[PDB]
Structure 1
Amino acid sequence: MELHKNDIELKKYNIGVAISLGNKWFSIDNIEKLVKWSLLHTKEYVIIYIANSIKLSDSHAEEVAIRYGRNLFIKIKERVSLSFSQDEQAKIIYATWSDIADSKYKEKVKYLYNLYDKNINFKNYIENFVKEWVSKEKRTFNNNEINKFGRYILEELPELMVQVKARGVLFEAYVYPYKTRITEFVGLLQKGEIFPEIKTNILDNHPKIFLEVRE
Structure 2
Amino acid sequence: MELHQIRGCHKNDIELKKYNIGVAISLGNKWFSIDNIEKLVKWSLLHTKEYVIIYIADSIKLSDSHAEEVAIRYGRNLFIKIKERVSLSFSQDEQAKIIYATWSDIADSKYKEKVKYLYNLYDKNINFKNYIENFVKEWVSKEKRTFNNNEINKFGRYILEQLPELMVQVKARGVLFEAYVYPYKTRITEFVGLLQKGEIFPEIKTNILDNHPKIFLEVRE
Give the shorter-chain TM-score range.
over 0.9
Distance (Å, rounded) in 2 between the aligned partners of 1:135 and 1:180: 15
Identity of aligned residues (%): 99
Distance (Å, rounded) in 1 between the aligned partners of 2:135 and 2:23: 24
Residue 67 of structure 1 deviates from its aligned partner by 0.0
Residue 163 of structure 1 deviates from its aligned partner by 0.1
Across the aligned residues of Structure 1 and Structure 2, the Cα RMSD in angstroms comes to 0.3
Residue 185 of structure 1 deviates from its aligned partner by 0.2
Distance (Å, rounded) in 2 between the aligned partners of 1:130 and 1:49: 22
Q: Which ranges of structure 1 fall in alignment gaps of 5 or more residues?
A: none
Distance (Å, rounded) in 2 between the aligned partners of 1:47 and 1:129: 27
| 1:190 lines up with 2:209 in the alignment | no
| 1:3 lines up with 2:32 in the alignment | no
Distance (Å, rounded) in 2 between the aligned partners of 1:120 and 1:129: 15
Residue 128 of structure 1 deviates from its aligned partner by 1.4
Distance (Å, rounded) in 1 between the aligned partners of 2:134 and 2:50: 39
Residue 129 of structure 1 deviates from its aligned partner by 1.4
Q: Secondary structure at the match of 1:174?
A: strand
Q: Secondary structure at the match of 2:180?
A: strand
Distance (Å, rounded) in 2 between the aligned partners of 1:174 and 1:128: 25
Residue 116 of structure 1 deviates from its aligned partner by 0.2
Structure 1 stretches of 4+ moved >2 Å: none
Q: Which ranges of structure 2 fall in alignment gaps of 5 or more residues?
A: 5-10
| 1:212 lines up with 2:218 in the alignment | yes
Distance (Å, rounded) in 2 between the aligned partners of 1:69 and 1:168: 20
Distance (Å, rounded) in 2 between the aligned partners of 1:73 and 1:85: 18
Equivalent of 1:14 in 11, 20, 32: 20
Distance (Å, rounded) in 1 between the aligned partners of 2:96 and 2:34: 19
- TM-score (normalised: structure 2): 0.97
Larger RCO, structures 1/2 (Cα 8 Å, 6+ apart): 2
Q: Secondary structure at the match of 1:47?
A: strand
Distance (Å, rounded) in 2 between the aligned partners of 1:172 and 1:124: 30
Q: Secondary structure at the match of 1:3?
A: strand
| 1:78 lines up with 2:80 in the alignment | no
Distance (Å, rounded) in 1 between the aligned partners of 2:96 and 2:110: 27
Residue 19 of structure 1 deviates from its aligned partner by 0.0
- TM-score (normalised: structure 1): 1.00
- Cα deviation digits, residues 100-140 of structure 1 (max 9, x gap): 00000000000000000000000000011110010000000
- Cα deviation digits, residues 25-48 of structure 1 (max 9, x gap): 000000000000000000000000
Distance (Å, rounded) in 2 between the aligned partners of 1:158 and 1:126: 14
| 1:94 lines up with 2:103 in the alignment | no
Distance (Å, rounded) in 2 between the aligned partners of 1:205 and 1:189: 12
Distance (Å, rounded) in 2 between the aligned partners of 1:194 and 1:85: 45
